[PDB]
Amino acid sequence: MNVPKARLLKVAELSAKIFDQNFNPSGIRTGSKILNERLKGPSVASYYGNPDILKFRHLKTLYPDIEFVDLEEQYRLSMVEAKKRRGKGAPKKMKKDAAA
Amino acid sequence: IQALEKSLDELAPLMMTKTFNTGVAKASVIPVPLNKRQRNRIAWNWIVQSANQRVSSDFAVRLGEELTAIAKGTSSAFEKRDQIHKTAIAHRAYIQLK
Amino acid sequence: SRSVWKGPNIVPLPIREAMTKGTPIRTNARAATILPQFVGLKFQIHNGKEYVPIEISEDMVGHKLGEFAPTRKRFSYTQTK
Amino acid sequence: GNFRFPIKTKLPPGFINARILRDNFKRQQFKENEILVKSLKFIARNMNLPTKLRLEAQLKLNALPNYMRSTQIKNRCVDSGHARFVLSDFRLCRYQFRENALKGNLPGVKKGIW
Amino acid sequence: TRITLPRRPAKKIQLGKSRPAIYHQFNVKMELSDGSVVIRRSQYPKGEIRLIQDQRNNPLWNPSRDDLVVVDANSGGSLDRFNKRYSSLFSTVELSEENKKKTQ
Amino acid sequence: VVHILGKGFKGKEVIKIALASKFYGIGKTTAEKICSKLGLYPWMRMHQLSEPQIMSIASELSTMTIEGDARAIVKDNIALKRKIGSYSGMRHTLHLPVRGQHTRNNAKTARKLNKIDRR
RNA sequence: AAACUCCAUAUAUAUAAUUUUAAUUAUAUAUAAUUUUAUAUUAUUUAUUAAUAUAAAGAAAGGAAUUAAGACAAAUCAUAAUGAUCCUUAUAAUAUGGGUAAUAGACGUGCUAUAAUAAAAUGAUAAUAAAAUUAUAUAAAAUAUAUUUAAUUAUAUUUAAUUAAUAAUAUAAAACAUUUUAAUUUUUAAUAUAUUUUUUUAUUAUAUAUUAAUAUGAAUUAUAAUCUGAAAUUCGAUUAUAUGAAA
Ligand SMILES: [Mg+2]
Ligand SMILES: [Mg+2]
Ligand SMILES: [Mg+2]
Ligand SMILES: [Mg+2]
Ligand SMILES: [Mg+2]
Ligand SMILES: [Mg+2]
Ligand SMILES: [Mg+2]
Ligand SMILES: [Mg+2]
Ligand SMILES: [Mg+2]
Ligand SMILES: [Mg+2]
Ligand SMILES: [Mg+2]
Ligand SMILES: [Mg+2]
Ligand SMILES: [Mg+2]
Ligand SMILES: [Mg+2]
Ligand SMILES: [Mg+2]
Ligand SMILES: [Mg+2]
Ligand SMILES: [Mg+2]
Ligand SMILES: [Mg+2]
């Protein structure tokens, strides 16, 4: 009726050898799909951006002549000093030498 | 098709009465003329309800039997037409040309 | 149901003291299977806040340690009417 | 011992919060320890190898810390840190996507009229 | 609230006509775990029976014996399936692999 | 009415469907069986059976764990879940879902079905 | 507010050497309508007037975006940012587990039923779509088992081709022929009929015995087993035999 199953299997073996493909008549769980999978690690890790982006700190080491200053940090410092003067603040953190 | 048209024209009421509770008790109903679509619907509902009272498991067979009966004048909704027409004849007085 | 061909779920837990001595095995590994080797050993399985003691029977084999340490206790409606 | 993670890593260049730091650490450590998990999984689920090798591979695979699990990487809003309704196309949460689209930041997005 | 079946008028068993009660019993053979057999009187219509778990295979009654296999009912419940389901692992390799945990 | 293993049947019925309908352990495939083994043609009406055929069906069904016995298997398994002190055991005892179903809004079923001694 | 605008409409023009073919297509530009007239009738600020009648000419008929000022101290300090405060060996950081999932009566919004104007099985020169996705993928054919010729559905084995008007996801499905389909003695057998033959008419059986409890429904359970994951116990989806409740 159909081609002999042995003939089909032989053709499969020959083609697999030629094209560098795994051959498995029995159908056992070889777990080759566990290995033949792409490494997504680089893309997953490069998700929140480049950590080496230039930051305001480096503008002193680069172009030391220009006297930059950041409104955000000045606002933070002003708020801290205002809290101190108004009487509020942050309690002194006890150093590591305390407690057992 | 001619038999069906005649059956619809003979079984569909010519008048009908709607509620007008804006006036006085009993809704002060006035008979109101109907169009061909409305008359056909009133006839068809009766035809279908009379055909569903038959035995055949197939709606086509039941409906054909009922239409044959109406064609030979053995319908069971002629009395419904008659009651509606008599009610219109009774309420003729309430008619008020708006 | 975990596929059989994968093999039973086994986690590193101390058994050598459990057999040589009578020391019970206190653990939070609720997802581990009860292998035939644990029968007769005393376990203390974490339920969320306290460790429940259980002795392993020959019938428990194949189940999970967490099936005998209920995490939530029964509901009781206080009608007060 | 003043760092919240076993291995020191850099800081994301933009919006930073504690959950973003956790997720970033998990991402990076998975990147450096993704080969080990794949190899160990193949060894531990391969029938042809000895059962002792399979057992030891499975035990070590289980003993691996959490910060090298592919299952614990979650997508977060790179502009807000919010981890609900995050579009992968822009790595932005729903509201940040809306405001950036209306503001013109996104490269080619526009309001939908059709 | 109690349920009881009614008492019928007891038939009078006269003085001297009261016979003893000899229920029907069979000389049944009872096989223990070992090859030993005991003849006994039983009212069940079963002349032959064998036991799987009994005195002859109990540690408490058999202290001197070195080896003593235990067994339970068969073809009932999910017994022994925890072993039948896993064929890759089979019996000393596991004993060696259970050497130590190295945890502290 | 015809009788097989003391169950009243109807002559209009088909054996292949009626066996599954009115036996605890019979269904599609196991009812195609029995019929196939005894040679009854696929759509016999059970009013066409001879007495030898009736007793052959009776014997074949008696050669299976069909009714009562299967109920015993299920009851024994539930009883074992209770005996071993399993979560599923107390769900069965308390008449609550045992396959991880939310109980907050609707568990109307298994309140009247789950129990230690199930049908 | 209307227009302007986007998706749609028609026409043209331009690109494609029609083997990225869908030229019956794709998308760049322009035109068109927020439609014109002609006689009719009521009318009426008289004709310069509308509402209709509808000969005519036109392809021409939709959709969504846009929802002002003021307010309801409406919701949002849990998208993020913030003033005052309030925690600083905690109210700030990590991991193992357990919470969010519990269940007496309530209440929303949905899914699936309760049969014959309606639900299953088959339809290989494979009846007929649109819009999307695929480098943090995709899975054609083929071969194995559940299950025996197949096929169909579930899993594995290999992975072809394509980072894509080309491969793939993917032979849309309902319709439409056919078979069946309990309540239904409205049926099925046995013989006889004969010009209804896939069929009807006889005489017998199909009668615990005509107004609801299946060959509808698939909730609830038992047991194999399989996906994904380090890992489904508390808690994930799957086929298989059994279970077959309420309606
Ligand atoms: Mg901040
Ligand atoms: Mg995730
Ligand atoms: Mg049944
Ligand atoms: Mg506008
Ligand atoms: Mg407004
Ligand atoms: Mg509020
Ligand atoms: Mg905040
Ligand atoms: Mg919730
Ligand atoms: Mg809603
Ligand atoms: Mg139906
Ligand atoms: Mg259905
Ligand atoms: Mg088709
Ligand atoms: Mg298309
Ligand atoms: Mg295929
Ligand atoms: Mg169909
Ligand atoms: Mg059904
Ligand atoms: Mg279901
Ligand atoms: Mg369900």
Selection from B54, B31, B40 nearest residue B8 by Cα: B40
- Using the structure block, give the residue that is written with the tokens 């002190």: F85
Joined tokens for residue E63: 């202290």
Q: Report the Cα E1 to chain-centroid distance in Å.
A: 39
- The residue written with tokens 């653990």 in the block is C27
- C-alpha distances (whole Å) from F29 to each of B71, D13, F35 are 53, 65, 10
Nucleotides of G under 7 A from a protein CB: 5-7, 63-65, 79-80, 83-86, 88-89, 92-104, 106-108, 116-118, 135-137, 139, 143-144, 147, 156-159, 182-189, 205-209, 214-215, 219-238, 240-245
Q: Indicate whether D28 belongs to any domain.
A: yes
Task: Tell me if D98 is assigned to some domain.
Answer: yes
Of chain D, the end-to-end C-alpha distance in Å amounts to: 58
Q: Strand, helix or coil at C2? A: coil
For residue D114, tell me if it sits in a domain: no
Domain membership of residue D32 (yes or no) is: yes
Q: For residues D80, D82, D88 and D89, what is the CA-based torsion angle, rounded to 10 degrees? A: -30
Give the Cβ contact number of residue C18 at 10 Å: 19
Q: Are D100 and D106 a contacting pair, CB within 8 Å?
A: yes
Nearest CA-CA partner of C11 in C36, C35, C29, C38: C29
D58 vs D39: CA distance, rounded Å: 11
Strand ranges (E), D17-109: 86-87, 92-93
> What is the C-alpha radius of gyration for chain B, rounded to an integer number of angstroms?
16
**Chain F CB within 8 Å of residue E78 CB:** yes
Distance, CA of D76 to CA of D19 (rounded, Å): 9
Residues of E (47-86) whose Cβ lies below 8 Å from C: 72, 77-79, 81-83, 85-86
- Structural domain boundaries, residue D80: 18-103
B42 is written with which tokens? 């009133």
Q: Which residues contact D113 (CB under 8 A, 6 or more apart)?
A: none
Does C60 contact F84 at a Cβ distance shorter than 8 Å?
yes
Q: Is A39 on the interface with D (CB under 8 A)?
A: yes
C-alpha–C-alpha distance, residues F60 and F42, integer Å? 17
Give the burial class of C34: count Cβ atoms within 10 A of its Cβ; 0-12 exposed, 13-18 middle, 19 or more buried.
buried
Q: Chain-centre distance of CA A33, in angstroms? A: 24
User: How big is the CA angle at A47 (ends A42 and A50), to the nearest 5 degrees?
Assistant: 90
**Helical H segments across chain B, by residue range:** 2-11, 36-51, 59-71, 78-91
Tell me how far apart the terminal alpha carbons of chain B are, to the nearest angstrom: 38
Q: Residues F25-34: contacts with CB within 8 Å, 24+ apart?
A: F25/F64, F25/F65, F25/F66, F25/F67, F25/F69, F25/F70, F26/F61, F26/F66, F30/F64, F34/F60, F34/F61
Q: SS3 for D93?
A: strand
Residue D1 lies in a domain: no
Whether the CB-CB separation of C15 and C25 falls below 8 Å is answered with yes
Backbone angles phi, psi at D46, to 5 degrees: -90, 125
d(CA C53, CA C69) in angstroms, rounded, equals 8
Q: Is the CB of F18 under 7 A from strand G?
A: yes
* E37 φ/ψ angles, rounded to the nearest 5 degrees: -130, 140
Nearest Cβ partner for E101 among C12, C36, C58: C12
- Helix H or strand E segment including F28: helix F28-38
Helix and strand totals (H; E) in chain C: 1, 3
Q: How far is the CA of E51 from the centre of ligand 17 (A)?
A: 46
Residue of E nearest to C5 (CA): E86
Dist. CA F103–CA A80, nearest whole Å: 53
Q: Find which of D54, D56, D58, D60 to mutate to test the C interface (most C CBs within 10 Å of its CB).
A: D58
Please, are residues A31 and A41 in contact by the beta-carbon 8 Å criterion?
no
H or E element: which one contains C25?
A: strand C25-27
Q: Which nucleotide is nearest to D40 (CA to C1')?
A: G230
CATH of the domain at D69: 1.10.287.1480
Determine the distance from the C-alpha atom of residue A25 to the mean position of all C-alpha atoms in its chain, rounded to a whole number. Answer: 40
- D42 is a domain residue: yes
Q: How many CB pairs under 8 A join C and F?
A: 18
**From which experimental method does this structure derive?**
cryo-EM
Q: What is the 3-state secondary structure (H, E, C) of F48-93?
A: CCCHHHHHHHHHHHHCCCCCCHHHHHHHHHHHHHHHCCCHHHHHHH
Q: Distance between CA atoms of F61 and B68, rounded to whole angstroms? A: 54
* Dihedral sign from CA coordinates of F1, F3, F8, F10: negative
Closest listed residue to residue D21, CA positions, set D29, D30, D13, D11 = D11
Q: Do C14 and E101 touch (CB under 8 A)?
A: yes
* Contact (CB, 8 A) for D82 and D93: yes
**Gap between the Cα atoms of B9 and B31, Å rounded:** 19
E95, two tokens: 């004993």
Identify the DSSP state of C73.
P
- Please tell me whether residue C59 adopts helix, strand or coil conformation: coil
Q: Which two tokens stand for residue C65?
A: 């340690």
Distance of CA F102 to the CA centre of its chain: 28
> Distance between CA atoms of B13 and E35, rounded to whole angstroms?
100
Q: How many domains does chain D have?
A: 1
Residues 24-63 of F with CB under 7 A from strand G: 24-31, 45, 47-48
